[PDB]
Amino acid sequence: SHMNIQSIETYQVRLPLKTPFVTSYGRLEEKAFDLFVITDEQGNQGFGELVAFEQPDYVQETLVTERFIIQQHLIPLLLTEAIEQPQEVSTIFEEVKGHWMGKAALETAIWDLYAKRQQKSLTEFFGPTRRKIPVGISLGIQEDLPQLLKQVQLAVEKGYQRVKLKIRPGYDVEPVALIRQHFPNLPLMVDANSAYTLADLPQLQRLDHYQLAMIEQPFAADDFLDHAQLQRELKTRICLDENIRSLKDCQVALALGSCRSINLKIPRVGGIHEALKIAAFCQENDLLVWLGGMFESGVGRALNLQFASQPTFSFPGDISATERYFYEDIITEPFILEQGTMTVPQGLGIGVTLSQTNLLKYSQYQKIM
């Protein structure tokens, strides 16, 4: 009675955004994502989400291309061997190069399935975990400092224990100074989104005076050497994102001295097994690791909350209630956020149940096998 996949179903969902995306390729009025439902011989069902964007701006994977790699190469690989432990999936997919998000979509669903098989919450496989966890908040560029200061104040009023400010060349030292002045002990970090170059090192060093938790990806998404040049000169921890796809990338960053913090995203790293290996390595080498979001639906969000609930993830991550980005979700229950703290879903697997009514109005169904 080993895990014997009876069927695989998928929903191509398009969830309306409260704030549509503007990309170099056009506008996006909704976040598109594919859901995968893997049913075993027992009737148990594992849920997974393909979160890849519709354009290769953040990273190379896109929804349409990963969707193809899943049906043409990954699913066939997944269906050849009987799986005993979810950790075996990463090994099974090993022969497929790249396509991390496509792998994660299927791999995370197998972990969910396995958990349900054991009649346990997936959290039971992540070692010690919290029931509720503080989450951070991120503010975009606010040229009107007074209003920005207003935002931080409301953030603190709502109990958020950490704040992230997006930053760019002509907007960094001034706004960070203002917030550090009105909030001396507030955990603060900045997000440079690759907006700087090595020539801006002088400017970036000024931030060392404001006790920031970290400065995220100031240089190119594919750079290690420039970041190392900066990290050597900074007391503040530099954080990498796009560049960290696996345990080995963390090992290369550590070797080069590229950073002292890692932004971890399960889909970007290919799944839970890889995310777990990366988190363990960061713990052993003083690399502050935290979890980031990717506009996931409730399916991916549930998993993020559970994974981020481990004590290790002490720095509040980028996780919010689904309604922060959407009007509705495709799962039946809402996540509860009270004073910057969210409850970690309990219940078998990821602890969420699909909303057939909403899936019916926002998605296209298809039985792969």
Place this chain on the structure above:
Amino acid sequence: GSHMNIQSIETYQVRLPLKTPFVTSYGRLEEKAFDLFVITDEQGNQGFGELVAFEQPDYVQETLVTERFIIQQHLIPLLLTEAIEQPQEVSTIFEEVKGHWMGKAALETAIWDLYAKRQQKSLTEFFGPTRRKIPVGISLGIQEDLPQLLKQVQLAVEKGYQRVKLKIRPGYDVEPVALIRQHFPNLPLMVDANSAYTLADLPQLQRLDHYQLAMIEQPFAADDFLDHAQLQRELKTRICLDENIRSLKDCQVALALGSCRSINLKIPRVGGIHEALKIAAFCQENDLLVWLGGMFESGVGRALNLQFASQPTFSFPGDISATERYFYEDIITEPFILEQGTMTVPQGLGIGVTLSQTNLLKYSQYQKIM
């Protein structure tokens, strides 16, 4: 004005019959599929480029179908946003697209070809010093029957090849190498490890260090820099990286970690000619032996490979062969000349080839994108 006004873009999805079908985890492939792109300006000049990506993501992540999609959905629209004057502008235009190196190169290489023709020059006139004819190497798979192996090496040498590449595996390395170095103590020989080894096999690889090998290619994982550096520090022989080198920055990291002393360069894998030129230069500046690898290109990609590899910096013969070595027929009108291990570099404007309308009709599906 001196800008290339693109009037039309045409594509051909080709499937060229292989003399030896591919065997993949997804099935046998009787032909090498690839897409050709033709970019015509207002003067009637036409640039040719090729999308070489395999039909499965086993070598590298890109696949023919997915890159084909990225090209029409993202790259072509981007390509058409500026009135391009210099081919170097393409890689900058494409910079915002993450990854998709092979898709980028397909169009980027066509623009270089178009520009050269526009300037009334052979593409070689843009690669600095270049040779008219160049020696190419030969590859040889695993051969447990040493006697025959020695026979094939004897054949290659008799045929003029000045370098041989042997596929190697954990229980098959020193044996065939020692045999060849004993019968050809002066022949340039390299070994392709195809990521079949692990760091624990160090002692076995060290034994190879005493056969004057030009290099040992990617003994460890395709995405590894650190294990390779550990090995490299223990060997006199040059370690060569491939899958892992997508840009100049990747070479900079490899050099900083001491991962290798040689680079397998493939234009498609690197995103085009511009990045390839930056990589070759950095290699020449840092004593990294660079050579051109192959990807079963049709005559379009092959013509470019010969022209780029003709630069004297590419001292080590690369994996470039006549199209006949892998295919029955080609989609260009003329076969490449190969005499005693030496191939003729295409002269003529751009990459110097003309498409075979007859063969394109036999082996491809046409589509006018713009």
